[PDB]
Structure formats: C-alpha cells, structure tokens
C-alpha cells in the first residue's frame, strides 16, 4: 500500500505520476522562484 525504497516494480496510476510530477513541479518551481540566477544572453 505505502510508499517505500525507491522501488522498480510497483506499477501505478495516473493519479500517483501527477501526484509526483505536480508535487515535483510545486517544490521545484517554488524553489526555483526563489532560488535560481541563470542569465543568458
């Protein structure tokens, strides 16, 4: 049921990959806000 060990047989859903991929994009985008200084051009 639960999470556990970075797995690599536990076949999901939809709904856990954008669970991750939202949760990933908040934390990232969140940190990325307010941490991240890359200019260019």
Request: a negative charge; proline letters at 0%.
């Given at each position: 049921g639960p999470?556990?060990?970075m797995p690599?047989?536990?076949t999901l859903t939809d709904?856990?990959?954008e669970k991750k991929?939202?949760?990933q994009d908040r934390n990232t985008r969140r940190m990325r806000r307010?941490?991240?200084?890359?200019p260019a051009w």
């Open positions: 999470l556990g060990s690599l047989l536990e709904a856990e990959m991929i939202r949760d307010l941490a991240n200084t890359a």
